[PDB]
Amino acid sequence: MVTIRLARHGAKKRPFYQVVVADSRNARNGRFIERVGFFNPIASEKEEGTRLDLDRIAHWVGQGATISDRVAALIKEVNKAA
Amino acid sequence: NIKSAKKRAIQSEKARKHNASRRSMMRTFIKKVYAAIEAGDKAAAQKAFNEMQPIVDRQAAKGLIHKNKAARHKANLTAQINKLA
Amino acid sequence: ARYLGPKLKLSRREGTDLFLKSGVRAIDTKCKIEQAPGQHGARKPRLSDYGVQLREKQKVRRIYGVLERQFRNYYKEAARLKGNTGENLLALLEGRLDNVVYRMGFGATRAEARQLVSHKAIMVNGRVVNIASYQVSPNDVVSIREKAKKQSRVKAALELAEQREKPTWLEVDAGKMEGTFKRKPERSDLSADINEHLIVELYSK
Amino acid sequence: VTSYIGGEGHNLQEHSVILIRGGRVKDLPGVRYHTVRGALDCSGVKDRKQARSKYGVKRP
Amino acid sequence: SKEKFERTKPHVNVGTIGHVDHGKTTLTAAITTVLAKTYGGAARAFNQIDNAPEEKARGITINTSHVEYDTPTRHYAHVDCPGAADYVKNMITGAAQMDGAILVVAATDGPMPQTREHILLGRQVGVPYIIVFLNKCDMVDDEELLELVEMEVRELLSQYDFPGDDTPIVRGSALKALEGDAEWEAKILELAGFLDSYIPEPERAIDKPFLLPIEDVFSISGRGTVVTGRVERGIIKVGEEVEIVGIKETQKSTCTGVEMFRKLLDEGRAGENVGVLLRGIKREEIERGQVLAKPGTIKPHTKFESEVYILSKDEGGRHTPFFKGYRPQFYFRTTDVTGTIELPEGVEMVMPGDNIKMVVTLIHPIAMDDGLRFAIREGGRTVGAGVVAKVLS
RNA sequence: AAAUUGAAGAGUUUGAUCAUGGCUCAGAUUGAACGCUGGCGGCAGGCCUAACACAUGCAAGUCGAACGGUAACAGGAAGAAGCUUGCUUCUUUGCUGACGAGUGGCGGACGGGUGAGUAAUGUCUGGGAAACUGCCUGAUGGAGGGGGAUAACUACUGGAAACGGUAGCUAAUACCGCAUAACGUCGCAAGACCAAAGAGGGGGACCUUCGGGCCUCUUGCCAUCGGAUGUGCCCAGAUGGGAUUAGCUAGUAGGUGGGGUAACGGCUCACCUAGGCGACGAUCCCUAGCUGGUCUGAGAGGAUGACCAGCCACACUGGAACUGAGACACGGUCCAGACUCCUACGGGAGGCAGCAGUGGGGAAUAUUGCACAAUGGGCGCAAGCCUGAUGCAGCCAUGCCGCGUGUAUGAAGAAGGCCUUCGGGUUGUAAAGUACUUUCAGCGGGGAGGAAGGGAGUAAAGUUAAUACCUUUGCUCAUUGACGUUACCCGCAGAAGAAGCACCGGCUAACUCCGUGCCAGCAGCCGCGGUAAUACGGAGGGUGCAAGCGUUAAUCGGAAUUACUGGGCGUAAAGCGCACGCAGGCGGUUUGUUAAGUCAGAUGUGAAAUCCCCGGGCUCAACCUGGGAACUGCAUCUGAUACUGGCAA
RNA sequence: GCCCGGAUAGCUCAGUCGGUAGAGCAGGGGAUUGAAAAUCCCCGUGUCCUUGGUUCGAUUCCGAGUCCGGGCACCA
Numbered sequence A: 001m002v003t004i005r006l007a008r009h010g011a012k013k014r015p016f017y018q019v020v021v022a023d024s025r026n027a028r029n030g031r032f033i034e035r036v037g038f039f040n041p042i043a044s045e046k047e048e049g050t051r052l053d054l055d056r057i058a059h060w061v062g063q064g065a066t067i068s069d070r071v072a073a074l075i076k077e078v079n080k081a082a
Numbered sequence B: 001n002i003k004s005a006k007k008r009a010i011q012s013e014k015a016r017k018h019n020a021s022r023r024s025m026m027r028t029f030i031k032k033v034y035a036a037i038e039a040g041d042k043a044a045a046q047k048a049f050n051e052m053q054p055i056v057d058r059q060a061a062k063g064l065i066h067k068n069k070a071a072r073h074k075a076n077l078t079a080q081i082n083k084l085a
Numbered sequence C: 001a002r003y004l005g006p007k008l009k010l011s012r013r014e015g016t017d018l019f020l021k022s023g024v025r026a027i028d029t030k031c032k033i034e035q036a037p038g039q040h041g042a043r044k045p046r047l048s049d050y051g052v053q054l055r056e057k058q059k060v061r062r063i064y065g066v067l068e069r070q071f072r073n074y075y076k077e078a079a080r081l082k083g084n085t086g087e088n089l090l091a092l093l094e095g096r097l098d099n100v101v102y103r104m105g106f107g108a109t110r111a112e113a114r115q116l117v118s119h120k121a122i123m124v125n126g127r128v129v130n131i132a133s134y135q136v137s138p139n140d141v142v143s144i145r146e147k148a149k150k151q152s153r154v155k156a157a158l159e160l161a162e163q164r165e166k167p168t169w170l171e172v173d174a175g176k177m178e179g180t181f182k183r184k185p186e187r188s189d190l191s192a193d194i195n196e197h198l199i200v201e202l203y204s205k
Numbered sequence D: 001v002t003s004y005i006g007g008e009g010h011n012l013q014e015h016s017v018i019l020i021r022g023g024r025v026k027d028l029p030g031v032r033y034h035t036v037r038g039a040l041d042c043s044g045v046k047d048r049k050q051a052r053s054k055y056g057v058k059r060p
Numbered sequence E: 001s002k003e004k005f006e007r008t009k010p011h012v013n014v015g016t017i018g019h020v021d022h023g024k025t026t027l028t029a030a031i032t033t034v035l036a037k038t039y040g041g042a043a044r045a046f047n048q049i050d051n052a053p054e055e056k057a058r059g060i061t062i063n064t065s066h067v068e069y070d071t072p073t074r075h076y077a078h079v080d081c082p083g084a085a086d087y088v089k090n091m092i093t094g095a096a097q098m099d100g101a102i103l104v105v106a107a108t109d110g111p112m113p114q115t116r117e118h119i120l121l122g123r124q125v126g127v128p129y130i131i132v133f134l135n136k137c138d139m140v141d142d143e144e145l146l147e148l149v150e151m152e153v154r155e156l157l158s159q160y161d162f163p164g165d166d167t168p169i170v171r172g173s174a175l176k177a178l179e180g181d182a183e184w185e186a187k188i189l190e191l192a193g194f195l196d197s198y199i200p201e202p203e204r205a206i207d208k209p210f211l212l213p214i215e216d217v218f219s220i221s222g223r224g225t226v227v228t229g230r231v232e233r234g235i236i237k238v239g240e241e242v243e244i245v246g247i248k249e250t251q252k253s254t255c256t257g258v259e260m261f262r263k264l265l266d267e268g269r270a271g272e273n274v275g276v277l278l279r280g281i282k283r284e285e286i287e288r289g290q291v292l293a294k295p296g297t298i299k300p301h302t303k304f305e306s307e308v309y310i311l312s313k314d315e316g317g318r319h320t321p322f323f324k325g326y327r328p329q330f331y332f333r334t335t336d337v338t339g340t341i342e343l344p345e346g347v348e349m350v351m352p353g354d355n356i357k358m359v360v361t362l363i364h365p366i367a368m369d370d371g372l373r374f375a376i377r378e379g380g381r382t383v384g385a386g387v388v389a390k391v392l393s
Numbered sequence F: 001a002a003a004u005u006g007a008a009g010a011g012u013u014u015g016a017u018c019a020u021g022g023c024u025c026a027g028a029u030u031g032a033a034c035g036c037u038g039g040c041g042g043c044a045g046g047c048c049u050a051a052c053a054c055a056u057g058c059a060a061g062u063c064g065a066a067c068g069g070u071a072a073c074a075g076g077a078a079g080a081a082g083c084u085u086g087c088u089u090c091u092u093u094g095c096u097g098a099c100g101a102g103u104g105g106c107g108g109a110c111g112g113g114u115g116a117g118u119a120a121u122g123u124c125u126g127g128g129a130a131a132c133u134g135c136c137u138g139a140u141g142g143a144g145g146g147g148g149a150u151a152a153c154u155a156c157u158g159g160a161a162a163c164g165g166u167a168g169c170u171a172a173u174a175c176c177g178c179a180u181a182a183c184g185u186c187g188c189a190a191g192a193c194c195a196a197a198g199a200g201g202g203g204g205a206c207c208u209u210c211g212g213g214c215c216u217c218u219u220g221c222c223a224u225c226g227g228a229u230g231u232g233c234c235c236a237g238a239u240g241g242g243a244u245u246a247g248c249u250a251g252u253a254g255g256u257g258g259g260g261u262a263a264c265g266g267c268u269c270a271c272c273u274a275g276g277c278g279a280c281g282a283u284c285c286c287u288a289g290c291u292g293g294u295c296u297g298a299g300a301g302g303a304u305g306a307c308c309a310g311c312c313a314c315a316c317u318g319g320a321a322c323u324g325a326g327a328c329a330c331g332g333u334c335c336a337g338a339c340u341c342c343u344a345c346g347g348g349a350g351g352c353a354g355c356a357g358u359g360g361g362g363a364a365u366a367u368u369g370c371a372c373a374a375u376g377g378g379c380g381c382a383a384g385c386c387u388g389a390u391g392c393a394g395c396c397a398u399g400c401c402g403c404g405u406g407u408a409u410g411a412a413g414a415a416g417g418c419c420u421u422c423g424g425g426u427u428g429u430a431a432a433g434u435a436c437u438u439u440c441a442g443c444g445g446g447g448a449g450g451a452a453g454g455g456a457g458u459a460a461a462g463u464u465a466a467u468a469c470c471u472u473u474g475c476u477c478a479u480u481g482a483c484g485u486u487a488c489c490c491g492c493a494g495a496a497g498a499a500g501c502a503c504c505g506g507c508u509a510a511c512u513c514c515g516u517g518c519c520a521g522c523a524g525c526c527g528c529g530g531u532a533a534u535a536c537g538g539a540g541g542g543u544g545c546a547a548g549c550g551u552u553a554a555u556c557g558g559a560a561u562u563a564c565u566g567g568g569c570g571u572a573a574a575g576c577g578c579a580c581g582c583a584g585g586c587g588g589u590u591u592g593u594u595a596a597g598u599c600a601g602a603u604g605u606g607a608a609a610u611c612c613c614c615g616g617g618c619u620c621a622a623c624c625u626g627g628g629a630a631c632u633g634c635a636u637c638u639g640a641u642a643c644u645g646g647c648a649a
Numbered sequence G: 001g002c003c004c005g006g007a008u009a010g011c012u013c014a015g016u017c018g019g020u021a022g023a024g025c026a027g028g029g030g031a032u033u034g035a036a037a038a039u040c041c042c043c044g045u046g047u048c049c050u051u052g053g054u055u056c057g058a059u060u061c062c063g064a065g066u067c068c069g070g071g072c073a074c075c076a
């Protein structure tokens, strides 16, 4: 089962999450097909915070890939008309 | 062992008791055809072939035998009946 | 981390005035300058080609208050950057906060400017900075916080900065202790004495 | 192998376990190692001041 | 290492003292089976008090074995000493941690040379209290002969500076109480009463900082190196910084469990024998004689001034003078060490039975402070007691 | 608009010289070790050796919405008995929630670890045909009716336990016929065939025989064909050293008859042919996980494969197969072994190269820690379990990076050391001081940010017979943090708590006095000492780095000292003693044609990471990260035909 | 934790059952040379592993230790 989920990169106490399309069995940090945007929880109100390429999501979710708890909410955060 | 999921040991042993009995049945019915083949015309061999056909197909569909195994045991065995007799 | 020894000993060995023991009075005439590095100061040095490079390197180090490990890192940065390797070495040294704090006049010496940076006094773009090595980017506004503003060490030290040449690249308000770093420093603006070419020779071999 | 006992005087005799580092002496033909003074049964040189990591002595 | 030791009933360090082959070790075996059967504690046997090849083919004891027997009032911890003339060094470690001894003189033989040598070591080291026990009795069926030995023990103790007549003398066979004789079972139950009545509650030092002399080092298969010994002062919590000071040099460490006769502890208090497990230390590098101190409290020294009181023939010691260069054994807390003597100016010779101060350079450094008590020995006998005056190193 | 901007020498053979040629040195780097010495933080990392043996504990379970259970637990409801009539005793009730003991459908095969083995059954790069696929998800079609058991649980014995019995009772999504089902197997076809399982939250209407018949909604079960993910198979080239290993091979090499495999095939038989391999190095021997990368280098190269990521292999040693979609299974079964264990001596165990830890090995690498809060994964409608996978912190100057240890004034140019041209200089603005600040730890008050949610009862809008349950978007709630006395922001005091250790004859930045006298010792190379040592030991004086510094080992560099770029062979090392000559390398000159080489474009692809530019967040950097090129690749169709080869005359 | 062996001038060894220890080989130390080797003339150059005891007197006899050698055990 393919799944869109965070990878957890960056330093100690200073995380940075590479949202990525990977297989269920493979590890968090490990194997994947293609990365699709990112997320930063320690960004705050500035120029950049979160980016998520919605065109590639249609290729995977449209076919048959689940979205994890955190990535499903970032699709709500980025919005359709807000 | 140091796990409470040793149920699979006793469940797999319980499976192969059944799984071997249905498998051994199948290969004796196939042996019944090979027994009929050698010294015999197209009559005794094809009677055995009609008996083993439902058993090999059924066992194939349960996940004991694969669908191609069954397919070969019809294909090559019909070729013994057709060519010789 | 720092030198913290006899500072005017460094000026006699090097020969020229390093602005280590600059302070309140303008000229020292209080060390037998040039002709007394140590016990054997009357000894005329033969001075090889590796000598003159290393004497030139240590002079630029002891003026700006940087150590070889950090100083080598500036050279590695300088080589990768565009333009001339020599001009970038010294342009990176002049962009330090403890050097800019000295050039603004908030400190009679550079060690006083280093301590004033370190002691939560210096603040730039509305953010306090402790690091003497802080790379001050173009178009900034260094300043002193309201608690430590107009303390007895800064007001006497700002009056010394009137006797100094005063850089063109940076500007000072002088009333409210507020500075403004504008552009990057040019070779021809400052020094006109410490050679860069010889320090590029020492690190390329 | 043979190892050189660098420094004035030593505590090595008969047995006594010692540590060995690399380095030829360049005088005794055959000898091509150095005893580490300080480590294990090989003690420091008595009454040294200048250069004491070499020859294994603490502060005065 | 499983059951947690509950801190109830005061702890007291007891041990058997006496002549060779005198029912000294066998008394300890009798005390277990008697107290275990009636009160209902842990059983144990006479075998576990001394096994090995050395205490079977021979029969004699070398190692100071330990036993834990409990009673309604207090929780005793036994220390079975060796007894022979060759084993005086490892005995003194067992005898120093002992608070109240149980002397062992026998009704057939009576007081014999080692009994005098043992009690001599008890005074100068630290043995406040002592209890007599006649460990044969049944072999000589007589009223007059058995009671004549009681008189000579009262003479011995009083002659050597103990109470003597005030000490409660008990009679009883150890082997008879081992099986199940109702009269002799009850007579060693009486000895447990005499331990409770005569010996008071001991005075500990749970205030001034941590110290623990190492009596015998172990290497537990799984945990690491364990050091045993009575905590002389202070406390030990689990996961606390501890410095090992004494012979060789000085090493940093941390405790990772304290125990009490194969039972866990949270706080190893003062005045009780505990096995401290140290972290990241080998069996060979840590040796017997060193002390577990709290960092900064004590420093190892190889030279010191000390007020040495030399003994005479009457008190028991040397009987001839000596000059600088003499090298006797100095017994501090546990171990002994040799050292050269340097006398003060204006003192030509040191006569026996005299109070003087002297500088003593030791070959090994040992952890020490001002006001530490030691007992000098040489030639299989005592020499002089004293106290430390000043540190030098 | 930026991605390569790219290359140093010196000493040392001689009386001196030029050459040859080794030796050594300056530079980088490192999983590092030692020695002296040590103060803090950011991110990293931290058994390279004995794939040695391992106590101890904890690392995979989970659904009651599969059923049996109306129970070993703990608690509501119809009713009961004591008596302080609601306080107590207490039988029934799926009936209170659940979940202990159970049988199934799934998980254990992933996640982790470690390189023993493997020089090609592996890996890498690029292709292919003969495959299979659980979970997820596309679309279709079901989802007819029966049976037989069996555990648990009594009972009764066996046995010390481990485990099995012996008579039963008893569900089911467990189990098995049956009728059917072609676009799904079988030959050309008429034919012959094979599959299943119900749960849970609600219900108006009418059957009530109350077990509720029956409608809904979800999840789940059906053969098929899918997509995705894979997983096996195959070929080509590449992927170490040795010829003082030159011959190797009989299921060996093919073909067919049979046989097996998910499937191609000596994978395995029976025969038939008697080959196949090898100087483009077979076979045998030694060594070795492989790659992305790392390191060094101007680049070619040389070295390398710790850390992150992919692939392979292995699981106490040696076998073996079972169960499944997937293993010949790391905490599965089974034998045999060795070595620890428990035994009532009949028989039982056991497998850290998962996390800590011990001994031992070693020059040398870490706590029997802390939490599921996040991020994955396992389970499940989800309320949450378990997760030593992740997260953290113990320890460790082991790294890369930051800030520390004060900051102005200071003449008597103090003393003491130290050289004395006993006049004086020198250490020296150094100290003592005389002014001011207080970073940093150390006390104390405030206090971000890792946190998205999860959950309740809700509105509407879907769903439908329905304003019920269910679902979605608005929508009101209360809360969740191991790290944690966080990061960070203000107040306390007073320089207060905080500097070495190399070196000093040349190379190579930096001098003297004593002591010693080819002795004692230094030594990376040359070389220092024989009574005036700049090299030894001491002292001062300096110089160079500094929280590190030296030494050590290890790789590249300099070494154009294996030279492809880029060397040589008269005399320095080096032309076989001289011929003939097969394989091999190279080949005059002119047209024609193929295009193998070569060249040009084409599409694929070189996993992501680092490496390199334009940016951004750590107070700054180190670190972190977004994009860009790069990834000098290797294959694939189309042309260009000069050159080289092929074939022409 | 305890049993055993080992130690003699700078190095390699003799000597003892209480009668006070020697040999070679190094080194000395003036001759000699810039300083050695050699030639020449004269030297043991000693805590008998350390320390105490039995005694008139201990290398020598008996304790106690030193560091090192090899041996057997204990698991809070």
Ligand SMILES: Nc1nc2c(ncn2[C@@H]2O[C@H](COP(=O)(O)OP(=O)(O)OP(=O)(O)O)[C@@H](O)[C@H]2O)c(=O)[nH]1
Pocket (backbone or CB within 6 Å): E018, E019, E020, E021, E022, E023, E024, E025, E026, E027, E059, E060, E061, E081, E082, E083, E084, E135, E136, E139, E172, E173, E174, E175, E176
């Ligand atoms: N008759 C009798 N004999 C005893 C008694 N106790 C001990 N024994 C004997 O002595 C031995 C016991 O050892 P003890 O000497 O008492 O104790 P120990 O600790 O071994 O003695 P040390 O050797 O001094 O340590 C046994 O072998 C008995 O034969 C007793 O009470 N009565």
Ligand SMILES: [Mg+2]
Pocket (backbone or CB within 6 Å): A041, A042
């Ligand atoms: Mg946020």
Ligand SMILES: [Mg+2]
Pocket (backbone or CB within 6 Å): none
């Ligand atoms: Mg927010």
Ligand SMILES: [Mg+2]
Pocket (backbone or CB within 6 Å): none
């Ligand atoms: Mg999930």
Ligand SMILES: [Mg+2]
Pocket (backbone or CB within 6 Å): B001
């Ligand atoms: Mg088993």
Ligand SMILES: [Mg+2]
Pocket (backbone or CB within 6 Å): B024, B028
């Ligand atoms: Mg059969």
Ligand SMILES: [Mg+2]
Pocket (backbone or CB within 6 Å): B062, B063
């Ligand atoms: Mg199946």
Ligand SMILES: [Mg+2]
Pocket (backbone or CB within 6 Å): B062, B063
């Ligand atoms: Mg099945």
Ligand SMILES: [Mg+2]
Pocket (backbone or CB within 6 Å): C069
């Ligand atoms: Mg630094």
Ligand SMILES: [Mg+2]
Pocket (backbone or CB within 6 Å): C046, C047, C048
């Ligand atoms: Mg020079």
Ligand SMILES: [Mg+2]
Pocket (backbone or CB within 6 Å): C137
């Ligand atoms: Mg900026």
Ligand SMILES: [Mg+2]
Pocket (backbone or CB within 6 Å): C204
């Ligand atoms: Mg370079």
Ligand SMILES: [Mg+2]
Pocket (backbone or CB within 6 Å): D050
């Ligand atoms: Mg020197």
Ligand SMILES: [Mg+2]
Pocket (backbone or CB within 6 Å): E021, E058, E059, E060
């Ligand atoms: Mg005896």
Ligand SMILES: [Mg+2]
Pocket (backbone or CB within 6 Å): E024, E025, E061, E080, E081, E082, E083
């Ligand atoms: Mg005894």
Ligand SMILES: [Mg+2]
Pocket (backbone or CB within 6 Å): E280
């Ligand atoms: Mg260690």
